[PDB]
Design an enzyme around this catalytic site. Structure first.
Site, PDB file in Angstrom:
ATOM      1  N   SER A   1      35.774  55.917  58.870  1.00 42.40           N
ATOM      2  CA  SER A   1      36.748  55.516  58.776  1.00 42.40           C
ATOM      3  C   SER A   1      36.803  57.310  57.761  1.00 42.40           C
ATOM      4  O   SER A   1      37.837  57.964  57.710  1.00 42.40           O
ATOM      5  CB  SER A   1      37.832  55.006  58.226  1.00 42.40           C
ATOM      6  OG  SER A   1      37.952  54.213  59.249  1.00 42.40           O
TER       7      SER A   1
ATOM      8  N   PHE B   1      44.248  49.900  45.766  1.00 38.44           N
ATOM      9  CA  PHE B   1      44.781  48.645  44.689  1.00 38.44           C
ATOM     10  C   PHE B   1      45.187  47.298  45.050  1.00 38.44           C
ATOM     11  O   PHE B   1      44.941  46.437  45.563  1.00 38.44           O
ATOM     12  CB  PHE B   1      46.233  49.485  44.945  1.00 38.44           C
ATOM     13  CG  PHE B   1      47.514  48.487  43.830  1.00 38.44           C
ATOM     14  CD1 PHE B   1      47.651  47.501  44.044  1.00 38.44           C
ATOM     15  CD2 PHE B   1      47.828  48.884  42.381  1.00 38.44           C
ATOM     16  CE1 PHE B   1      48.825  46.906  43.734  1.00 38.44           C
ATOM     17  CE2 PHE B   1      48.350  48.369  42.124  1.00 38.44           C
ATOM     18  CZ  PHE B   1      49.372  47.011  42.158  1.00 38.44           C
TER      19      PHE B   1
ATOM     20  N   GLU C   1      54.628  45.770  47.577  1.00 31.22           N
ATOM     21  CA  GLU C   1      54.191  44.834  46.946  1.00 31.22           C
ATOM     22  C   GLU C   1      55.443  44.317  46.611  1.00 31.22           C
ATOM     23  O   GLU C   1      54.740  43.032  45.856  1.00 31.22           O
ATOM     24  CB  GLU C   1      53.278  45.034  46.012  1.00 31.22           C
ATOM     25  CG  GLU C   1      51.712  46.055  46.166  1.00 31.22           C
ATOM     26  CD  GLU C   1      51.135  45.232  46.844  1.00 31.22           C
ATOM     27  OE1 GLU C   1      51.251  43.479  46.848  1.00 31.22           O
ATOM     28  OE2 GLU C   1      49.415  45.591  47.336  1.00 31.22           O
TER      29      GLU C   1
ATOM     30  N   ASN D   1      40.165  53.504  64.305  1.00 25.49           N
ATOM     31  CA  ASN D   1      39.355  52.715  63.207  1.00 25.49           C
ATOM     32  C   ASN D   1      39.762  51.881  62.208  1.00 25.49           C
ATOM     33  O   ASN D   1      39.546  51.359  61.975  1.00 25.49           O
ATOM     34  CB  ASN D   1      37.828  53.436  62.467  1.00 25.49           C
ATOM     35  CG  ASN D   1      37.165  53.088  62.241  1.00 25.49           C
ATOM     36  OD1 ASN D   1      36.884  52.614  60.588  1.00 25.49           O
ATOM     37  ND2 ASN D   1      36.513  52.754  63.176  1.00 25.49           N
TER      38      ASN D   1
ATOM     39  N   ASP E   1      49.548  34.732  46.713  1.00 28.27           N
ATOM     40  CA  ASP E   1      50.562  36.399  47.096  1.00 28.27           C
ATOM     41  C   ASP E   1      49.818  36.090  48.726  1.00 28.27           C
ATOM     42  O   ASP E   1      49.461  34.649  48.955  1.00 28.27           O
ATOM     43  CB  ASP E   1      49.760  37.087  47.012  1.00 28.27           C
ATOM     44  CG  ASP E   1      47.840  37.699  47.009  1.00 28.27           C
ATOM     45  OD1 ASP E   1      47.264  35.913  47.569  1.00 28.27           O
ATOM     46  OD2 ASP E   1      47.311  38.292  46.661  1.00 28.27           O
TER      47      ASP E   1
ATOM     48  N   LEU F   1      47.469  41.396  40.727  1.00 31.17           N
ATOM     49  CA  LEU F   1      46.507  39.544  41.050  1.00 31.17           C
ATOM     50  C   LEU F   1      45.954  39.632  39.772  1.00 31.17           C
ATOM     51  O   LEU F   1      45.587  39.703  38.585  1.00 31.17           O
ATOM     52  CB  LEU F   1      44.837  40.138  41.590  1.00 31.17           C
ATOM     53  CG  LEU F   1      44.288  38.535  41.928  1.00 31.17           C
ATOM     54  CD1 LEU F   1      45.185  37.558  42.725  1.00 31.17           C
ATOM     55  CD2 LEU F   1      43.009  38.931  42.651  1.00 31.17           C
TER      56      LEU F   1
HETATM   57 XE   LIG Z   1      38.746  54.626  53.973  1.00 33.22          XE
END
Ligand SMILES: [Xe]
Ligand SMILES: [Cl-]
Ligand SMILES: [Cl-]
Ligand SMILES: [Xe]
Ligand SMILES: [Xe]
Ligand SMILES: [Xe]
Length: 162
Positions: free
Chosen positions: A117, A104, A11, A132, A20, A32
């Site tokens: 997933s 996050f 980040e 995936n 961003d 954010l």
């Molecule tokens: Xe995930």
């Protein structure tokens, strides 16, 4: 390596409000501030988050402070979400950090929609999960970062952050 370091690499750190990757107002370590296109909204949210009139600028420490609260909230987010927690508890330390990352980044809700997933992860089908995960808007939009995260989830090691 650990979640805080991991996230601080992905980040970055900016002491002045910035836009961003999606074009939204952010500050510090990826905090954010608002999806609204008003710089003034951002500053207001900022002053509220911080507790003073920052005029759009913070110290290193205030940013760090926000980052901590943010890492925390993210984990809590996970633990409080029905689709997430079982997956996460099932995982080793490394891969959990990968889960926190994603959360996050995209909120709990969005990760919570990686249904397929999630199951592969839970069954510890690493390679299939990895394929995936890459089939997503997340990956096409932020490919370098998504790959670090995916590699970390697929291997259980910190090699991508070395
Ligand atoms: Xe995930
Ligand atoms: Cl806040
Ligand atoms: Cl990229
Ligand atoms: Xe997860
Ligand atoms: Xe993950
Ligand atoms: Xe993965």
């Amino acid at each position: 390596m650990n979640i805080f370091e991991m996230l601080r690499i992905d980040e970055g750190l900016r002491l002045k409000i910035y836009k961003d990757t999606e074009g939204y107002y952010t500050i510090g370590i990826g905090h954010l501030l608002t999806k609204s296109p008003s710089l003034n909204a951002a500053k207001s949210e900022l002053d509220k988050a911080i507790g003073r009139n920052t005029n759009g600028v913070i110290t290193k420490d205030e940013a760090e402070k926000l980052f901590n609260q943010d890492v925390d909230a993210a984990v809590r987010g996970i633990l409080r979400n029905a689709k997430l927690k079982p997956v996460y508890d099932s995982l080793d330390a490394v891969r959990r950090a990968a889960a926190i990352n994603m959360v996050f980044q995209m909120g709990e809700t969005g990760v919570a929609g990686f249904t397929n997933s999630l199951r592969m992860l839970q069954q510890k089908r690493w390679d299939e999960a990895a394929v995936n995960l890459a089939k997503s808007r997340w990956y096409n939009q932020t490919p370098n970062r998504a790959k670090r995260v995916i590699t970390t989830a697929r291997t259980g090691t910190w090699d991508a952050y070395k």
